UniProtKB/Swiss-Prot annotation, chain A:
The chain holds residues 299 to 446 of 446 of the full protein. Autophosphorylated. It is found in: Cell membrane. Member of the two-component regulatory system PrrB/PrrA that is involved specifically in early intracellular multiplication of Mycobacterium and is essential for its viability. Functions as a sensor protein kinase which is autophosphorylated at a histidine residue and transfers its phosphate group to the conserved aspartic acid residue in the regulatory domain of PrrA. In turn, PrrA binds to the upstream promoter regions of target genes including itself to positively regulate their expression. Coiled coil: none annotated. Residues 1-137 form the Histidine kinase domain. This is Sensor-type histidine kinase PrrB. It comes from Mycobacterium tuberculosis (strain CDC 1551 / Oshkosh).
Length: 137, 138, 136
């Protein structure tokens, strides 16, 4: 493997910083989260987060995005929550089956890390994209 | 080597213990008072090595008490993770460092990437004493 | 086959590696956001190496700056130098020749559906702009 230790919490923090520079007047931040290290592909993980933000903004019309990481013995749950249009419950499988409104890059990267990607409704009003990745221990 | 950055090891261990306390509900985990030590390295990898040491102590050692410590010297830093678990038999030590999770191969790989060593001793607490010795930045 | 590439990290490693090959060269990545694209890591590093080689060996550059500017369209990678530059009437045909010769750069631009072009650099010599489309 080309897999290496990745501080997923820091990855999200930098992703929010950089996204804020690309999408003007987007409010995008990492919500307070404990540090979580996994072993993975940092370019691939970052890509999946970038794509999630880009779809939230460009296709969901989001103006607020929150990134979060919740950890456990099982691994990590990364979430990308937005206040955009969201995804109707019966359109999720089709959305993950499409490359960019398409989240197929996210699904691809989750699979490469032995985890899964799914969609839920956000408390922010739009989509909540959840990537669950296995922990290194 | 050009990926290496300053790491407050004592602060890293302090947050590793706090984050671990949240993951393992029963566990008593803390950093024993140690002087500030700065080295050069890879903070994700060093933190991983610690996480993996605590994970092994709890999941496979049945530890309910873990103590983290850092001792500085002219040679660099000695990080130890001590637990009150079942420990590691002397004859199983090298075999544990070759195995990925009881398996500490992640600790050994990170120790090596930093020009240092990971070794297993016996702890005063009853279980294992995992020692990483890492050369200083000068 | 194209794979996620942290272009910014690629540029940084290319600067570090060039710094040890060329005596009396100040070569660096200027502060730049992390940008991931999908691409051919070996070809993209080759393009950057070729740009640095041409600035130093043929332009006489003693200072080279690499940069990456991200946007929704993708990434604009620039290699600026303080050498003698590329004459204006040479700025398109130079991308057709191998090494003064930047055909390897043009080739990689095209494989990524991007473009490579040359402009005046603030540093005095050439500014080579490689634009690559984003993954999203």
């Amino acid at each position: 493997d080309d897999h290496v230790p990745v501080d997923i919490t820091d990855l999200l923090d930098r992703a929010a910083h950089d996204a804020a520079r690309i999408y003007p007047d987007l409010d995008v931040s990492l919500v307070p989260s404990p540090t979580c290290i996994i072993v993975g592909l940092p370019a691939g993980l970052r890509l999946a987060v970038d794509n999630a933000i880009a779809n939230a903004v460009k296709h969901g019309g989001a103006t607020l995005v929150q990134l979060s990481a919740v950890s456990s013995r099982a691994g990590v749950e990364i979430a990308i929550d937005d206040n955009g249009s969201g995804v109707p419950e019966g359109e999720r499988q089709v959305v993950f089956e499409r490359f960019s409104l398409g989240l197929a890059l996210v699904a691809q990267q989750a699979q490469l890390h032995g985890g899964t990607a799914s969609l839920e409704n956000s408390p922010l009003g739009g989509a909540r994209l959840v990537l669950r990745l296995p922990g290194p221990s």
